[PDB]
Amino acid sequence: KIIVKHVTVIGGGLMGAGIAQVAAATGHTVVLVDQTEDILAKSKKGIEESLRKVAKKKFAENPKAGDECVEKTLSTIATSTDAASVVHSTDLVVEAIVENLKVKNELFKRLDKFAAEHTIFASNTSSLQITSIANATTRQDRFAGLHFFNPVPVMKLVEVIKTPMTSQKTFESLVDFSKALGKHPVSCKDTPGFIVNRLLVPYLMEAIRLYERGDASKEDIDTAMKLGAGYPMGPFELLDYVGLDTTKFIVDGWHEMDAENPLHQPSPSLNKLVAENKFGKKTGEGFYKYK
Amino acid sequence: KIIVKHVTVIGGGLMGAGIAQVAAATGHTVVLVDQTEDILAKSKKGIEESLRKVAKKKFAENPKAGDECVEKTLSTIATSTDAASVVHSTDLVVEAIVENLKVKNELFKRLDKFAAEHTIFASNTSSLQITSIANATTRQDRFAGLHFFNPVPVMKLVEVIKTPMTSQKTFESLVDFSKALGKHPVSCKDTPGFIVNRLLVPYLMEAIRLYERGDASKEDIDTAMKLGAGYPMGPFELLDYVGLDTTKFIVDGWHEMDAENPLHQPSPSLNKLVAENKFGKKTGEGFYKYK
Numbered sequence: 092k093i094i095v096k097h098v099t100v101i102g103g104g105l106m107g108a109g110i111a112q113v114a115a116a117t118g119h120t121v122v123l124v125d126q127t128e129d130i131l132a133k134s135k136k137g138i139e140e141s142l143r144k145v146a147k148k149k150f151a152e153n154p155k156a157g158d159e160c161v162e163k164t165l166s167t168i169a170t171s172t173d174a175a176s177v178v179h180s181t182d183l184v185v186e187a188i189v190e191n192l193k194v195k196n197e198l199f200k201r202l203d204k205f206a207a208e209h210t211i212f213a214s215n216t217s218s219l220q221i222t223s224i225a226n227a228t229t230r231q232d233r234f235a236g237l238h239f240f241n242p243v244p245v246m247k248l249v250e251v252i253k254t255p256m257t258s259q260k261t262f263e264s265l266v267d268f269s270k271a272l273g274k275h276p277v278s279c280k281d282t283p284g285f286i287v288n289r290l291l292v293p294y295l296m297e298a299i300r301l302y303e304r305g306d307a308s309k310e311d312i313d314t315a316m317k318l319g320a321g322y323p324m325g326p327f328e329l330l331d332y333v334g335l336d337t338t339k340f341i342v343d344g345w346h347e348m349d350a351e352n353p354l355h356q357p358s359p360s361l362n363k364l365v366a367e368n369k370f371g372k373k374t375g376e377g378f379y380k381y382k
Numbered sequence: 383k384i385i386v387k388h389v390t391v392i393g394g395g396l397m398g399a400g401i402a403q404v405a406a407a408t409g410h411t412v413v414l415v416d417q418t419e420d421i422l423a424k425s426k427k428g429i430e431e432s433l434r435k436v437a438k439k440k441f442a443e444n445p446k447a448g449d450e451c452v453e454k455t456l457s458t459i460a461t462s463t464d465a466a467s468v469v470h471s472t473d474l475v476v477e478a479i480v481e482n483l484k485v486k487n488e489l490f491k492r493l494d495k496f497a498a499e500h501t502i503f504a505s506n507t508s509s510l511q512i513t514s515i516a517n518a519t520t521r522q523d524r525f526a527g528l529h530f531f532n533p534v535p536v537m538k539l540v541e542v543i544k545t546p547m548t549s550q551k552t553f554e555s556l557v558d559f560s561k562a563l564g565k566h567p568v569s570c571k572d573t574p575g576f577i578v579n580r581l582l583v584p585y586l587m588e589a590i591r592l593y594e595r596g597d598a599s600k601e602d603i604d605t606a607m608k609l610g611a612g613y614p615m616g617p618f619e620l621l622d623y624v625g626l627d628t629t630k631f632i633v634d635g636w637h638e639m640d641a642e643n644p645l646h647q648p649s650p651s652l653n654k655l656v657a658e659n660k661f662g663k664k665t666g667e668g669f670y671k672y673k
Binding site: 240246247248250275277278279280282286287289290291293294297298301304305306307308311312314315316318319320321322323324326352353354 | 531537538539541566568569570571573577578580581582584585588589592595596597598599602603605606607609610611612613614615617643644645
């Protein structure tokens with residue numbers, strides 16, 4: 092077995108920054124990648140703040156212990172603008188960039204040329220088939236899905252997605268990496284939505300439709316699911332939380348691939364809010380208004 | 383206004399006994415009705431057992447008061463095998479008997495004739511349209527749905543279902559009664575599944591279909607929804623908890639009412655388990671095995 096030690100995370104966004112943070116907090120050597128030195132300086136800054144925040148809470152009685160912790164983690168996170176320049180010596184590539192098939196494929200097709208033989212490639216995509224991306228390389232046996240959830244440093248789940256090509260060796264290594272990250276890996280075929288989103292998102296849509304249909308208010312629907320089902324957040328609160336634009340995007344993809352399917356039918360209320368640029372807590376307003 | 387004080391609960395079952403227990407515990411006068419004295423004696427005994435389990439904890443420092451509290455609450459619950467003789471002057475009738483439109487309609491058609499003028503009629507049905515029972519009487523303005531959740535004495539939620547004929551006065555009276563019960567009422571029209579089941583059940587079926595499709599194991603699916611969505615129980619753990627037969631029965635109802643909708647398509651796996659009488663925890667086995 093080849094133990095994942097060096098990880099190259101591509102994408103300075105919220106997801107990739109958190110993936111890097113957790114990988115580094117658990118002793119992995121990390122290289123975060125994005126287009127500009129400024130974008131990277133900012134991403135790594137978000138990580139620093141997150142770490143100090145977790146520090147002033149873990150070592151709330153010993154600031155020095157906290158500084159050392161933060162420092163030790165932040166030091167094992169390097170940054171580069173061209174991933175091709177570091178994958179020749181990396182054990183794992185975790186991609187978390189724009190949800191565009193062409194862009195992702197161009198990325199992996201090139202990295203395939205630089206990455207060492209044993210290097211494994213994984214995408215954190217929520218809206219594309221892992222296979223579609225794997226076939227942009229001739230390393231499909233070492234390519235798979237590694238799907239995290241926001242906030243990455245907190246959510247313990249990680250879906251390890253195997254395509255009909257991924258090798259058992261690649262899978263196991265990713266299962267071990269997940270555990271090494273302090274996460275709990277689960278397995279799912281390379282089908283749309285995998286497990287979590289496949290069961291969560293359609294439900295959220297139903298909540299929206301029941302509301303649009305006028306059967307009940309958003310407030311009661313949230314109250315109903317929190318008190319009646321024990322959910323941390325009612326569906327509308329959660330929609331605003333995960334992003335209305337993010338939600339609409341995933342569902343549009345499922346709808347495009349299967350229009351006759353009523354479960355992916357667009358929502359006038361969802362589309363309207365996204366068109367009015369009300370993405371939820373991201374913009375201070377979605378179904379509900381925020382401070 | 384119409385302040386509910388005397389309540390007639392029809393159905394010695396788990397739910398009915400729970401409604402009776404909570405109404406009595408909150409200072410309402412209660413009459414629990416069922417078919418035989420043996421049934422009643424049993425149901426009332428369960429209530430006492432549940433009431434005592436609670437007291438031993440809350441009144442540990444003063445067992446005297448605890449016993450008094452349990453006794454007071456018990457004496458406030460009466461029993462009868464003749465609903466017609468009880469409803470002559472009761473304020474509210476909460477029906478929680480067998481999920482069968484015929485039986486329910488005979489009971490109400492009968493009670494409508496013996497009940498006082500102001501008396502309100504309500505059903506705790508999960509598998510039937512409230513309107514399909516209210517018409518079995520000529521008191522539709524005082525007929526509505528009052529949907530509770532097991533364990534009734536614990537679950538603070540209650541859905542108040544107002545049909546197109548239901549009075550605003552009846553609705554409000556039911557809303558105040560719910561608060562008087564120490565519950566939190568939410569409103570919803572008389573549509574299948576109301577709020578909670580409408581959004582919960584179909585999701586549970588989707589988890590089953592995902593598993594039957596061979597996409598993931600039950601174990602990973604439950605882990606995914608708990609760690610990934612923060613749910614108290616995984617979908618299969620919850621199916622066993624709420625009863626596989628109970629679930630199947632409701633889905634069959636929705637399926638027959640509209641065999642076109644994909645969400646209500648029968649599950650071969652669900653049907654099999656029900657067939658071989660494996661309804662979940664209330665049987666020691668369903669998707670998982672217990673004790």
